[PDB]
Amino acid sequence: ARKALIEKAKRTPKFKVRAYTRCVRCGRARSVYRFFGLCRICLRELAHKGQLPGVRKASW
Amino acid sequence: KIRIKLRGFDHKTLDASAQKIVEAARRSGAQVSGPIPLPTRVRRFTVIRGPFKHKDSREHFELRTHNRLVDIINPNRKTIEQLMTLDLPTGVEIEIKTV
Amino acid sequence: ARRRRAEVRQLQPDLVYGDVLVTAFINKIMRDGKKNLAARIFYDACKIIQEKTGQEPLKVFKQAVENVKPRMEVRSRRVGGANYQVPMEVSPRRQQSLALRWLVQAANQRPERRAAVRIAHELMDAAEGKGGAVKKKEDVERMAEANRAYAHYRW
Amino acid sequence: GNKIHPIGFRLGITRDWESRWYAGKKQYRHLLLEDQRIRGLLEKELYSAGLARVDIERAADNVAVTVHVAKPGVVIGRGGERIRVLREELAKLTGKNVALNVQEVQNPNLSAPLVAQRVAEQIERRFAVRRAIKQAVQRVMESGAKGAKVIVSGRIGGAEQARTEWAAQGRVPLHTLRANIDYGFALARTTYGVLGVKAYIFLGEVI
Amino acid sequence: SLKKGVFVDDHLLEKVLELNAKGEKRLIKTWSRRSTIVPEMVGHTIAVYNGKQHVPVYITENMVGHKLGEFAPTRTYRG
Amino acid sequence: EQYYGTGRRKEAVARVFLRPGNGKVTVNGQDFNEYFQGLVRAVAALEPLRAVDALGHFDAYITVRGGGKSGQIDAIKLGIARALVQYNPDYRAKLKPLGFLTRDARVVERKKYGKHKARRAPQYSKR
Amino acid sequence: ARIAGVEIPRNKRVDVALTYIYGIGKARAKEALEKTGINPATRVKDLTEAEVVRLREYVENTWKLEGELRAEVAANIKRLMDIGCYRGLRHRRGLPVRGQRTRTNARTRKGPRKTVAGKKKAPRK
RNA sequence: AAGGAGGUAAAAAUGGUAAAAAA
RNA sequence: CCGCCGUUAGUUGCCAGCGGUUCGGCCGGGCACUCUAACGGGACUGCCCGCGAAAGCGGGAGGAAGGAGGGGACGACGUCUGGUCAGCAUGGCCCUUACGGCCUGGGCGACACACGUGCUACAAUGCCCACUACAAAGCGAUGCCACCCGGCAACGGGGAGCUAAUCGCAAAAAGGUGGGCCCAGUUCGGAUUGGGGUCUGCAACCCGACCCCAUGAAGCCGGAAUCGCUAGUAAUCGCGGAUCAGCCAUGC
């Protein structure tokens, strides 16, 4: 698995409701903020490396 | 009658735009609507600690786009001329609309 | 807390009559976050008092205060492998606290018709002395007396 | 032990993004994608001479192929032919507009990421960790900072019990904001597994 | 479920019209237990697919407007 | 001519305008006695003008919005208190020992992550 | 006032009275209270028998109640035992008809609870 | 009330768990 | 980040100043005032009175702000051979026309208990119906949908504006004004269930959700013992978001 997962999402089968997010820079389908196309930790790692723009270490 | 909306990411060059901009429009023309600040647009993201099953213990992160506004009253040649090209928003873009 | 001696902090200078104890009693009448209708209710009761009797509401209030005063309340002494159940002279702040709260729950204890009604009728009998909080007053007095052996076992 | 990213801790006024353009809510994600793949393809096929800043300036199709490297001359080409191919591979995998940048900062021991990279280079080729690495911290302080802390986690010499070494010198105030601490993590990798090479570098205040 | 219309496999209806065209042998064996037992299935042996075997069920009428495999338990042992 | 009070509490802007008169006081359009009916703390906010007995001689135009009704009331406390502390700064020195100068600090703290109501921690098991 | 199945409500709002009847929720109460005439607010005890009798006429006519209702449901229950449709399969079992849960919660569509011996677990310390 | 020292009374429901070893 | 003040700024706001008003800040205009968001100022035991060898201490004053002003992000040297290769990498090990890929469905929702943690309740500060006002925040272009109409409703037809502080989700609820219920398993409570629609989606049986009628159980405040909370905190009450076609969301 995992390998043919990204395929299923990269290939987009038939009906609309067989789709599911994908952390393109980590590889996960669940809890993927479909604004970055990133999982929680993919988002976090790019955020911390100093590699995420517009965004900031929120502290309100 | 000239509505120029500022879509930036950092309030630095965004207000630094605002200033020089309003000058060279007062320069090559006349009255300029002073840089009016639209409420800075922020997005909310609430991630967690580690990749390991932890729910609680978290870190939240915020996206910070800024929005401002500059207007004038007259479409003189020189105004348009200078302030249509003489730009440098390496990380900012705008929206020209009329009224 | 261990570093401090905390505080009581002044409550609210009664939104109407002009005295802390009124909005204190209302404070303990309050339905958790709904001071509004509790204060209302209370004043329904008070004005009904004033339409039933000819004695002042604040007066009869002070008479409730006095009628339920735990001069000596019962706690416990320090002795390792036991606890001496020991009474002691209370502080008028704690006396009044306990008191007014007891009046609150004595009013609550009456399976009556309405809130203002319960609070009122209670306030009547309790200020009189023929009341629940009063009975528990005289009772805890009995506790501080039947434990007058623990009169020098007060921490 | 944690230590929330001193880099992501410097976000306020002590570090600006490695990417400064405008991004609209729609085309934002895709910009993040395109850019990320770009950066990545730089990283490896433009490893060669070691680099830190992977900056990008964009807006409407303009692309600032911007890099802070340790060396330019042997990554520009023997006849300016390395810039050629690479820049063009970008414009090929990013059918838009490209413009290289090989900005160089004169000091290697200064700026963490590449010192971490070189330290990790030492052990990757099997050298004695503690010695060479401690004296590496001492190279960094030979340059002259106020603090340098290169810790190294992973399998030391094998022996299963993969611990973490302790190498540092000088004061290191990563609690402080206005201090500018360059931090670089090099990925060490032995035939017997993976080691982690973290390098902290303390600049100073009033900046 | 379905609101304006109703669900049933199309290969079903098309197979209804054949088995009815002759009134042939028994055994309808859907590999699809979904499809509603819609009115025009009369009362024939339904070897619906479990996930295991082809659970056969003699349909009557007290079940018409309600799914096929809805009648196989599949989940073994009860209480 | 005018007596302006900048009034605020727990985010509720009481913009206070005053002129002299008798008791014509309009809270954001409507009379006092409807814009805050039922609340006992309403007349409470009528303490500053009542502590100086210049309660009457005022025809106020009070634009009050945002936040909450009772919070509006307290906001008008600060507003009134600010409007007169302006046009006769004698009342200033004598009103601070009544507290009618302090704005507020009692604000609904952020709901903390991990816990329920900003502080309400989730129940503990262990066993 | 035995209009329905031996149903006598007595002194109260006619609507509450009606509500106390099987087959009649408050909706059907006010429904009959707009179709038969009779005033809801007015007490049912002090009624006038003309409006009363025409009321009971409209009531049992246009719709029916407990006698058939539940029994009918028990006939559609006979069907729920016709083959053992999973609905009636589970109804036969003595468990909820919805495929919800039954691991922990089942205190209504089943009895309370009937103790075992736990059967214990797997390491937790 | 400082310490330190010199003799008298206080104070553990229960606990089995190993091991070549890694520097 | 949040309270006081300050400079600039004007499709949110404003008659605060006047003019008119299908009498709507709608039609001129201002920026003081709401406000929105950048650069600041402002508080230090700095001062007054007393005490303490000093730290520090009580009282009091100017103050929007007292002696750490309220919250956040910050979490060392290091312990736990703690966890996660089922996010990710990476040593070793095993399989390799199968322990790999696709598909279909079934399943992870099971039921004799036990337990965690939650929700709504068991009620006259209450529950039902009617009436009138104040939210902060985020979200929204095959999304947000105003709006008229259809239908008891779900939801649908026609159909304005908007890449928005300008159009919309939006209906806040608690409040409060006016009537019912009148201590009853009660018009309390919605669990169980049957009878029908709609919407989602290829498709809803196991397995979605919404809505209409009816059934209206248990449950009349809960022992051994145990939770949380020191101030805009407890409780109470409402709302936006992320992932989402939908939704089992009482989760966060």
Short mmCIF file of N, CA, C and O (backbone and C1' of nucleotides) in Angstrom, two decimals, chain D residues 1-5 9 26 149 155 161 166 174-175 190-194, chain I residues 73-82 89-92 140-141 163-164:
data_model
loop_
_atom_site.label_atom_id
_atom_site.label_comp_id
_atom_site.label_asym_id
_atom_site.label_seq_id
_atom_site.Cartn_x
_atom_site.Cartn_y
_atom_site.Cartn_z
N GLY D 1 13.41 15.51 25.59
CA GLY D 1 13.84 16.87 25.32
C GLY D 1 13.28 17.44 24.03
O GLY D 1 13.33 16.80 22.98
N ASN D 2 12.74 18.65 24.12
CA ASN D 2 12.35 19.41 22.94
C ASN D 2 13.29 20.59 22.77
O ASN D 2 14.36 20.61 23.38
N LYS D 3 12.86 21.54 21.94
CA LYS D 3 13.55 22.81 21.70
C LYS D 3 12.91 23.47 20.49
O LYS D 3 13.53 23.49 19.42
N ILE D 4 11.69 23.97 20.64
CA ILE D 4 10.92 24.48 19.50
C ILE D 4 11.79 25.37 18.61
O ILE D 4 12.54 26.22 19.09
N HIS D 5 11.70 25.08 17.31
CA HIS D 5 12.55 25.67 16.27
C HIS D 5 12.97 27.11 16.53
O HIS D 5 12.17 28.03 16.39
N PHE D 9 11.12 30.30 15.82
CA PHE D 9 11.05 31.14 17.00
C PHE D 9 11.51 32.54 16.62
O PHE D 9 11.10 33.52 17.24
N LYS D 26 -6.67 31.01 -3.63
CA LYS D 26 -6.82 29.99 -4.66
C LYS D 26 -5.47 29.37 -5.04
O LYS D 26 -5.15 28.25 -4.63
N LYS D 149 26.77 25.71 19.35
CA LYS D 149 26.35 24.49 20.02
C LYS D 149 25.98 23.42 19.00
O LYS D 149 24.85 23.37 18.53
N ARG D 155 23.32 6.84 15.92
CA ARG D 155 24.22 5.75 16.27
C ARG D 155 25.70 6.14 16.17
O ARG D 155 26.26 6.19 15.08
N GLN D 161 23.14 1.32 20.92
CA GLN D 161 22.75 2.40 21.83
C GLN D 161 23.06 3.75 21.22
O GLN D 161 24.12 4.33 21.47
N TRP D 166 27.65 15.82 23.12
CA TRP D 166 27.56 17.16 23.68
C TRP D 166 28.76 18.00 23.28
O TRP D 166 29.83 17.88 23.87
N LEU D 174 18.88 31.10 23.30
CA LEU D 174 17.76 30.89 22.37
C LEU D 174 16.38 31.17 22.98
O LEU D 174 15.36 31.03 22.30
N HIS D 175 16.36 31.56 24.25
CA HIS D 175 15.13 32.05 24.87
C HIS D 175 14.92 33.46 24.37
O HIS D 175 13.79 33.92 24.22
N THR D 190 24.73 6.78 8.19
CA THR D 190 25.74 5.74 8.12
C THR D 190 25.18 4.47 7.50
O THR D 190 23.96 4.31 7.39
N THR D 191 26.07 3.57 7.10
CA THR D 191 25.67 2.26 6.59
C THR D 191 24.95 1.48 7.69
O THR D 191 24.23 0.52 7.40
N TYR D 192 25.15 1.88 8.94
CA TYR D 192 24.45 1.27 10.06
C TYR D 192 23.29 2.13 10.57
O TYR D 192 22.85 1.95 11.71
N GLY D 193 22.80 3.05 9.75
CA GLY D 193 21.60 3.78 10.11
C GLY D 193 21.60 5.27 9.86
O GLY D 193 22.11 5.75 8.85
N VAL D 194 21.02 6.01 10.80
CA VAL D 194 20.90 7.46 10.65
C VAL D 194 21.36 8.20 11.90
O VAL D 194 21.05 7.81 13.03
P A I 73 0.80 28.98 24.70
"O5'" A I 73 2.07 29.15 23.75
"C5'" A I 73 1.93 29.17 22.34
"C4'" A I 73 3.07 29.90 21.68
"C3'" A I 73 4.46 29.50 22.15
"O3'" A I 73 4.96 28.33 21.52
"C1'" A I 73 4.29 31.83 22.27
P C I 74 5.70 27.21 22.41
"O5'" C I 74 6.86 28.02 23.16
"C5'" C I 74 7.89 28.64 22.41
"C4'" C I 74 8.87 29.42 23.26
"C3'" C I 74 9.76 28.61 24.19
"O3'" C I 74 10.83 28.02 23.48
"C1'" C I 74 9.06 30.67 25.20
P G I 75 11.14 26.45 23.61
"O5'" G I 75 12.20 26.38 24.78
"C5'" G I 75 12.49 25.15 25.41
"C4'" G I 75 12.07 25.18 26.86
"C3'" G I 75 11.98 23.83 27.54
"O3'" G I 75 13.25 23.39 27.99
"C1'" G I 75 10.08 25.18 28.08
P A I 76 13.56 21.84 28.28
"O5'" A I 76 15.15 21.79 28.45
"C5'" A I 76 16.00 22.21 27.40
"C4'" A I 76 16.94 23.31 27.84
"C3'" A I 76 18.25 22.84 28.46
"O3'" A I 76 19.25 22.64 27.47
"C1'" A I 76 17.22 24.45 29.87
P C I 77 19.70 21.16 27.03
"O5'" C I 77 20.66 20.71 28.21
"C5'" C I 77 21.84 21.45 28.50
"C4'" C I 77 22.49 20.91 29.74
"C3'" C I 77 22.26 19.43 29.99
"O3'" C I 77 23.05 18.55 29.21
"C1'" C I 77 21.74 20.60 31.94
P G I 78 22.31 17.45 28.30
"O5'" G I 78 21.37 16.67 29.32
"C5'" G I 78 21.93 15.92 30.38
"C4'" G I 78 20.91 15.57 31.43
"C3'" G I 78 19.96 14.43 31.10
"O3'" G I 78 20.55 13.15 31.29
"C1'" G I 78 18.77 16.22 32.11
P U I 79 19.89 11.85 30.61
"O5'" U I 79 18.72 11.44 31.61
"C5'" U I 79 19.01 10.86 32.88
"C4'" U I 79 17.77 10.68 33.72
"C3'" U I 79 16.82 9.58 33.28
"O3'" U I 79 17.20 8.32 33.82
"C1'" U I 79 15.60 11.58 33.75
P C I 80 17.33 7.01 32.89
"O5'" C I 80 15.83 6.64 32.51
"C5'" C I 80 14.93 6.19 33.50
"C4'" C I 80 13.49 6.43 33.11
"C3'" C I 80 12.95 5.59 31.95
"O3'" C I 80 12.43 4.35 32.39
"C1'" C I 80 12.30 7.90 31.73
P U I 81 13.31 3.00 32.39
"O5'" U I 81 13.59 2.71 30.85
"C5'" U I 81 14.73 1.96 30.45
"C4'" U I 81 15.18 2.36 29.07
"C3'" U I 81 14.38 1.79 27.91
"O3'" U I 81 13.18 2.52 27.70
"C1'" U I 81 16.70 1.60 27.45
P G I 82 12.17 2.14 26.52
"O5'" G I 82 10.76 2.05 27.26
"C5'" G I 82 10.45 2.94 28.33
"C4'" G I 82 9.19 3.71 28.06
"C3'" G I 82 8.74 3.75 26.61
"O3'" G I 82 8.07 2.58 26.18
"C1'" G I 82 8.71 5.93 27.46
P A I 89 9.18 8.06 3.45
"O5'" A I 89 10.20 7.34 4.42
"C5'" A I 89 11.56 7.25 4.07
"C4'" A I 89 12.36 8.38 4.66
"C3'" A I 89 13.71 7.98 5.23
"O3'" A I 89 14.73 7.95 4.24
"C1'" A I 89 12.53 9.22 6.85
P U I 90 15.07 6.60 3.42
"O5'" U I 90 16.14 5.86 4.32
"C5'" U I 90 17.31 6.53 4.77
"C4'" U I 90 17.80 5.91 6.05
"C3'" U I 90 17.73 4.39 6.11
"O3'" U I 90 18.80 3.74 5.45
"C1'" U I 90 16.75 5.27 8.05
P G I 91 18.65 2.17 5.10
"O5'" G I 91 19.27 1.45 6.37
"C5'" G I 91 20.57 1.79 6.84
"C4'" G I 91 21.04 0.85 7.92
"C3'" G I 91 20.81 -0.63 7.66
"O3'" G I 91 21.76 -1.22 6.79
"C1'" G I 91 20.10 -0.11 9.84
P G I 92 21.29 -2.36 5.76
"O5'" G I 92 20.76 -3.54 6.70
"C5'" G I 92 21.67 -4.30 7.48
"C4'" G I 92 20.98 -5.01 8.63
"C3'" G I 92 20.07 -6.17 8.29
"O3'" G I 92 20.77 -7.36 7.97
"C1'" G I 92 18.99 -4.79 9.85
P G I 140 -12.87 30.62 3.26
"O5'" G I 140 -14.07 30.89 2.25
"C5'" G I 140 -15.05 29.89 2.03
"C4'" G I 140 -16.27 30.44 1.34
"C3'" G I 140 -16.01 31.41 0.21
"O3'" G I 140 -15.63 30.77 -0.99
"C1'" G I 140 -17.74 32.24 1.58
P A I 141 -14.15 30.98 -1.57
"O5'" A I 141 -14.38 31.74 -2.95
"C5'" A I 141 -14.38 31.02 -4.17
"C4'" A I 141 -15.70 31.15 -4.88
"C3'" A I 141 -15.76 30.58 -6.29
"O3'" A I 141 -16.02 29.18 -6.28
"C1'" A I 141 -16.79 32.73 -6.21
P U I 163 -15.71 40.30 -5.93
"O5'" U I 163 -14.53 39.97 -4.90
"C5'" U I 163 -14.66 38.88 -4.01
"C4'" U I 163 -13.48 37.94 -4.10
"C3'" U I 163 -12.10 38.58 -4.14
"O3'" U I 163 -11.66 38.98 -2.85
"C1'" U I 163 -12.24 36.75 -5.68
P A I 164 -11.65 40.53 -2.44
"O5'" A I 164 -13.10 40.78 -1.81
"C5'" A I 164 -13.72 42.05 -1.94
"C4'" A I 164 -14.77 42.28 -0.88
"C3'" A I 164 -14.27 42.36 0.56
"O3'" A I 164 -13.76 43.63 0.90
"C1'" A I 164 -16.09 40.88 0.46
#
